[PDB]
Design a protein around this ligand. Structure first.
Ligand SMILES: [Cl-]
Ligand SMILES: [Cl-]
Ligand SMILES: [Cl-]
Ligand SMILES: [Cl-]
Ligand SMILES: [Cl-]
Ligand SMILES: [Cl-]
Ligand SMILES: [Cl-]
Ligand SMILES: [Cl-]
Ligand SMILES: [Cl-]
Ligand SMILES: [Cl-]
Ligand SMILES: [Cl-]
Ligand SMILES: [Cl-]
Ligand SMILES: [Pt+2]
Ligand SMILES: [Pt+2]
Ligand SMILES: [Pt+2]
Ligand SMILES: [Pt+2]
Ligand SMILES: [Pt+2]
Ligand SMILES: [Pt+2]
Ligand SMILES: [Pt+2]
Ligand SMILES: [Pt+2]
Ligand SMILES: [Pt+2]
Ligand SMILES: [Pt+2]
Ligand SMILES: [Pt+2]
Ligand SMILES: [Pt+2]
Ligand SMILES: [Pt+2]
Ligand SMILES: [Pt+2]
Ligand SMILES: [Pt+2]
Ligand SMILES: [Pt+2]
Ligand SMILES: [Pt+2]
Ligand SMILES: [Pt+2]
Ligand SMILES: [Pt+2]
Ligand SMILES: [Pt+2]
Lengths: 172, 172, 172, 172
């Protein structure tokens, strides 16, 4: 219906709107994660900083998707944003496990959208995702995996010590 | 219950959580406003820019409230974020009228929270709002009022012309 | 037949030659558009400048295709270049409508070539188009759509006024 | 009685003198805390530095109150300064617990003085405290709470190790 729209299916348009919702939900989750680690009874500033930076990145990803939706002549449609899955996030290990589950869900949504684009013979969409999302997700997931491994080696028989040291010597 | 909490009522803690929700909702609204004016069939870049900057400011306000909630020993609780009130925002005049209604609602929430703080004899809260929110809101509302007046004078018998000129000569 | 040629079909080679012709034709069209707006009885310097810059870009696109044809071991074959579809281009609105029709035809040719490359399992070709042509076309088409919307809002009941203002305040 | 005094009650004047005494007492306490951590058999330089900086800050707060007392036309009256509550301060955990108790007592005195000012309709006093004391106290108390949480997580089954690491990696 737009004057500019060309080779942009309704199915891809809708799936992009849904992916915007998922990225904004993920940003909201990271916001909650960050402020949890800033509580005086949690107090891990490098962990807070790690998650607040991811909140920014996910919002930015949403904004990139929205810009692309308008460049293609689709129409942004916003839905309610559900609250994060928890109010309290446990230990740094617990939080990093929730983070990697969240990133793998975003990655799967990206892969699903790429498959849809491929089925709809939409190369601009496929290039867009390849260029700005797929590698960024793989790199982040790798980094979170590396963090989980280091967190876990640090538990030992002194879990508090290990949590402090990881925050001080990796994250800060 | 926190080790740090002192003179911070449950009523203020809850009202701060609700105000965070209102600011994040307002940011979401501004996000939608901005991307609407970036549509190829709307195409008012200075209007898009105006609203995207307000989306940033409202998110920042939420983050300031959350930081203060943790400094006082309260506990951030996030709720679902409702979607904006419209999907399409009309003319620049329509959008600026919706914006001033939104800002007056935030201002009222701030005034209500200040009244609660006063009733609870919570001077740190009152100072916080005075210092970082109340003047910012008055200044913004004044600016939006000035814009509405200029938009309206520009309608005349050539509404398209006036909309272009306001975007070009005030907003851009 | 070249010593270097590998995985480069005859069908893709021919289609690249045809796309070079289309890009050079488009450059020629933009040349004519630009010099039309430089006529003393048309006299819209920002419109002339807009189209002369597109003439350059389209020639550059042709040259990129030719460089790629030789990198793959294909052989450039040039055909006659037909003259542009008009001698006189009307108003800025008329000209911008002809421009977006032209860009959508180039975009379709790019999409058709990408589909051919996909059918011929030629990933270097697909990457080439994705990297240097497909996004450039979407961005240009979006920009032209934005311009058409602004031009149209400016017609009103004073078409000459609107044409001057768009040239002065958007294009120049 | 001063030529300048206006809207400055006797009750506020006396309460300001008492608050000067409390701030100077707090500085003295921090002096003792700092020199304790500089003992050769305690030897935690980052802890010493933390407390010596607080000794400076509390003296500065006293001096600000005295300057304000003279700006309002009140009259500074000094009393004996009692010695700190302990001669030896234990572990870093013990010392940080004593510090937060001390800061909460200063904060309460500030809140009490603000309430008195409010009852006496003395807005200059209320502004003074809001501007230079109330937020500074909340921020400090938050920081001490964060430190206590980190100190406690570090005790584990190796209290000496944890005390060294906190001094090295947070305080120094
Ligand atoms: Cl479709
Ligand atoms: Cl920070
Ligand atoms: Cl939910
Ligand atoms: Cl309460
Ligand atoms: Cl922009
Ligand atoms: Cl709703
Ligand atoms: Cl072949
Ligand atoms: Cl020129
Ligand atoms: Cl011809
Ligand atoms: Cl009096
Ligand atoms: Cl030193
Ligand atoms: Cl004593
Ligand atoms: Pt940070
Ligand atoms: Pt960082
Ligand atoms: Pt693909
Ligand atoms: Pt890109
Ligand atoms: Pt990117
Ligand atoms: Pt902008
Ligand atoms: Pt700006
Ligand atoms: Pt107040
Ligand atoms: Pt402040
Ligand atoms: Pt501020
Ligand atoms: Pt020029
Ligand atoms: Pt130029
Ligand atoms: Pt492809
Ligand atoms: Pt390239
Ligand atoms: Pt390129
Ligand atoms: Pt020092
Ligand atoms: Pt220092
Ligand atoms: Pt007050
Ligand atoms: Pt001051
Ligand atoms: Pt100050």
């Amino acid at each position: 219906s737009s004057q500019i729209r060309q080779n942009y299916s309704t199915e891809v348009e809708a799936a992009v709107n849904r992916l915007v919702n998922l990225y904004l939900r993920a940003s909201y989750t990271y916001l909650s994660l960050g402020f949890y680690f800033d509580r005086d009874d949690v107090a891990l500033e490098g962990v807070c900083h790690f998650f607040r930076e991811l909140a920014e990145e996910k919002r930015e990803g949403a904004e990139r998707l929205l810009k692309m939706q308008n460049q293609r002549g689709g129409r942004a449609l916003f839905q309610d944003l559900q609250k994060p899955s928890q109010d309290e996030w446990g230990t740094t290990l617990d939080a990093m496990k929730a983070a990697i589950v969240l990133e793998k869900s975003l990655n799967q949504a990206l892969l699903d959208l790429h498959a849809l684009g491929s089925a709809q013979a939409d190369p601009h969409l496929c290039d867009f995702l390849e260029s700005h999302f797929l590698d960024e997700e793989v790199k982040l997931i790798k980094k979170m995996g590396d963090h989980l491994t280091n967190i876990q080696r640090l538990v030992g028989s002194q879990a508090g010590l290990g949590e402090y040291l990881f925050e001080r010597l990796t994250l800060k």
